[PDB]
Design a protein around this motif. Structure first.
Motif, PDB file in Angstrom:
ATOM      1  N   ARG A 136      -4.695  14.162  -4.883  1.00 11.77           N
ATOM      2  CA  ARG A 136      -3.510  13.721  -4.171  1.00 11.77           C
ATOM      3  C   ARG A 136      -3.747  13.560  -2.675  1.00 11.77           C
ATOM      4  O   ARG A 136      -3.031  12.795  -2.023  1.00 11.77           O
ATOM      5  CB  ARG A 136      -2.388  14.713  -4.479  1.00 11.77           C
ATOM      6  N   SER A 137      -4.753  14.224  -2.114  1.00 16.43           N
ATOM      7  CA  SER A 137      -5.032  14.079  -0.691  1.00 16.43           C
ATOM      8  C   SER A 137      -6.224  13.189  -0.384  1.00 16.43           C
ATOM      9  O   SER A 137      -6.243  12.568   0.676  1.00 16.43           O
ATOM     10  CB  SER A 137      -5.267  15.440  -0.041  1.00 16.43           C
ATOM     11  N   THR A 138      -7.222  13.108  -1.260  1.00 14.51           N
ATOM     12  CA  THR A 138      -8.349  12.223  -0.983  1.00 14.51           C
ATOM     13  C   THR A 138      -7.975  10.766  -1.197  1.00 14.51           C
ATOM     14  O   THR A 138      -8.289   9.918  -0.359  1.00 14.51           O
ATOM     15  CB  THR A 138      -9.546  12.596  -1.855  1.00 14.51           C
ATOM     16  N   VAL A 139      -7.273  10.461  -2.285  1.00 12.60           N
ATOM     17  CA  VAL A 139      -7.000   9.070  -2.635  1.00 12.60           C
ATOM     18  C   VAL A 139      -5.927   8.472  -1.732  1.00 12.60           C
ATOM     19  O   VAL A 139      -6.041   7.322  -1.304  1.00 12.60           O
ATOM     20  CB  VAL A 139      -6.623   8.976  -4.126  1.00 12.60           C
ATOM     21  N   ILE A 140      -4.887   9.235  -1.398  1.00  8.83           N
ATOM     22  CA  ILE A 140      -3.813   8.688  -0.574  1.00  8.83           C
ATOM     23  C   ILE A 140      -4.263   8.521   0.872  1.00  8.83           C
ATOM     24  O   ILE A 140      -3.997   7.492   1.502  1.00  8.83           O
ATOM     25  CB  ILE A 140      -2.553   9.567  -0.693  1.00  8.83           C
ATOM     26  N   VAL A 174       0.828  -1.206   0.000  1.00  6.93           N
ATOM     27  CA  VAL A 174       0.000   0.000   0.000  1.00  6.93           C
ATOM     28  C   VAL A 174       0.865   1.261   0.000  1.00  6.93           C
ATOM     29  O   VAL A 174       0.563   2.233  -0.703  1.00  6.93           O
ATOM     30  CB  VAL A 174      -0.988  -0.041   1.182  1.00  6.93           C
ATOM     31  N   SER A 175       1.981   1.255   0.734  1.00  5.25           N
ATOM     32  CA  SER A 175       2.887   2.395   0.685  1.00  5.25           C
ATOM     33  C   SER A 175       3.636   2.493  -0.636  1.00  5.25           C
ATOM     34  O   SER A 175       4.170   3.560  -0.945  1.00  5.25           O
ATOM     35  CB  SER A 175       3.889   2.331   1.831  1.00  5.25           C
ATOM     36  N   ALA A 176       3.708   1.413  -1.415  1.00  2.00           N
ATOM     37  CA  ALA A 176       4.218   1.541  -2.772  1.00  2.00           C
ATOM     38  C   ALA A 176       3.150   2.076  -3.715  1.00  2.00           C
ATOM     39  O   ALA A 176       3.461   2.845  -4.628  1.00  2.00           O
ATOM     40  CB  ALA A 176       4.746   0.198  -3.270  1.00  2.00           C
ATOM     41  N   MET A 177       1.889   1.692  -3.513  1.00  2.00           N
ATOM     42  CA  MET A 177       0.819   2.239  -4.340  1.00  2.00           C
ATOM     43  C   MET A 177       0.463   3.675  -3.988  1.00  2.00           C
ATOM     44  O   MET A 177      -0.250   4.321  -4.761  1.00  2.00           O
ATOM     45  CB  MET A 177      -0.453   1.401  -4.238  1.00  2.00           C
ATOM     46  N   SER A 178       0.906   4.180  -2.840  1.00  2.00           N
ATOM     47  CA  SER A 178       0.657   5.571  -2.492  1.00  2.00           C
ATOM     48  C   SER A 178       1.694   6.513  -3.084  1.00  2.00           C
ATOM     49  O   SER A 178       1.339   7.593  -3.560  1.00  2.00           O
ATOM     50  CB  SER A 178       0.616   5.737  -0.973  1.00  2.00           C
ATOM     51  N   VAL A 179       2.971   6.128  -3.062  1.00  2.00           N
ATOM     52  CA  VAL A 179       4.016   6.954  -3.658  1.00  2.00           C
ATOM     53  C   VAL A 179       3.893   6.941  -5.177  1.00  2.00           C
ATOM     54  O   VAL A 179       4.223   7.926  -5.849  1.00  2.00           O
ATOM     55  CB  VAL A 179       5.394   6.468  -3.164  1.00  2.00           C
ATOM     56  N   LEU A 180       3.357   5.858  -5.739  1.00  2.00           N
ATOM     57  CA  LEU A 180       3.143   5.778  -7.176  1.00  2.00           C
ATOM     58  C   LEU A 180       2.009   6.685  -7.638  1.00  2.00           C
ATOM     59  O   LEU A 180       1.984   7.072  -8.807  1.00  2.00           O
ATOM     60  CB  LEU A 180       2.886   4.318  -7.559  1.00  2.00           C
ATOM     61  N   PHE A 181       1.093   7.061  -6.747  1.00  2.00           N
ATOM     62  CA  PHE A 181      -0.005   7.942  -7.122  1.00  2.00           C
ATOM     63  C   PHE A 181       0.323   9.415  -6.903  1.00  2.00           C
ATOM     64  O   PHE A 181      -0.360  10.276  -7.466  1.00  2.00           O
ATOM     65  CB  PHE A 181      -1.270   7.564  -6.342  1.00  2.00           C
ATOM     66  N   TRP A 182       1.357   9.724  -6.118  1.00  2.00           N
ATOM     67  CA  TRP A 182       1.813  11.104  -5.985  1.00  2.00           C
ATOM     68  C   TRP A 182       2.342  11.647  -7.307  1.00  2.00           C
ATOM     69  O   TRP A 182       2.260  12.852  -7.559  1.00  2.00           O
ATOM     70  CB  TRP A 182       2.906  11.194  -4.923  1.00  2.00           C
ATOM     71  N   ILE A 183       2.882  10.780  -8.159  1.00  2.00           N
ATOM     72  CA  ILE A 183       3.469  11.199  -9.425  1.00  2.00           C
ATOM     73  C   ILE A 183       2.627  10.677 -10.583  1.00  2.00           C
ATOM     74  O   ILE A 183       3.124  10.488 -11.698  1.00  2.00           O
ATOM     75  CB  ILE A 183       4.932  10.732  -9.519  1.00  2.00           C
TER      76      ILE A 183
END
Lengths: 47, 69, 74
Positions: free
Chosen positions: B33-37, B13-22
């Motif tokens: 960037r704030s609702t989904v993460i 999940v922490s890999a899928m969160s940093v992947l969604f920042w970019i």
């Protein structure tokens, strides 16, 4: 171009208007038909 | 078993969160960037608290009625 | 007819949720489930009480099609 202003607030600017009297009643409608100027009271301490 | 199940799901999940920042769209960028993460964070934490406390329980059920079938 | 604005919808919504819920309750009484039939103080006969819930599902379906046409008048 236009910023988002949902993480923090939008960036403001104070603008001074030198308006002639013959177009003073005219330019007030122009600044009212676009609703994005908040005027501040310069004639305070006047009854 | 395996307390490392929670840590492995945490890595995923922490890999899928940093992947969604970019990968977030440019238009409503801070809302994506704030609702989904931050919903992955709370959806992870509630699963992790529910999966623990059942890993090594101290109390067993009883169920006194329970038809013998 | 009826008031057909606050009285037809109030029965069609109740009958639409009456068919769906009672059907799956009667299905879970048809097959023994240990949550609907698993206790010593609980209905015993199994799929005999699925029949009397299935008939109430059909009665709610009758109410649903009877009050669903009464809003179709307008």
């Amino acid at each position: 171009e236009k910023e988002e202003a949902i993480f923090r607030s939008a960036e403001m600017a104070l603008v001074q208007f030198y308006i002639p009297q013959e177009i003073s009643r005219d330019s007030a409608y122009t600044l009212g038909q676009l609703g994005l100027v908040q005027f501040r009271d310069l004639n305070s301490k006047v009854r | 078993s395996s307390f490392y199940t929670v840590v492995g799901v945490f890595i995923v999940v922490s890999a899928m969160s940093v992947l969604f920042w970019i990968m977030a769209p440019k238009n409503n960028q801070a809302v994506w960037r704030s609702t989904v993460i931050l919903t992955l964070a709370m959806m992870f934490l509630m699963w992790a608290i529910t999966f623990l406390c059942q890993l090594h329980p101290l109390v067993a059920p009883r169920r006194s009625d329970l038809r013998p079938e | 007819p009826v008031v057909s604005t606050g009285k037809a919808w109030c029965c069609t919504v109740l009958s639409a949720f009456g068919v769906v819920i009672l059907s799956v309750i009667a299905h879970l009484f048809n097959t023994n489930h240990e949550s609907f039939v698993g206790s010593i103080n609980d209905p015993e006969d199994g799929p005999a009480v699925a029949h009397t819930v299935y008939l109430a599902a059909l009665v709610y379906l009758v109410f649903f099609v009877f009050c669903g046409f009464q809003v179709y008048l307008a």
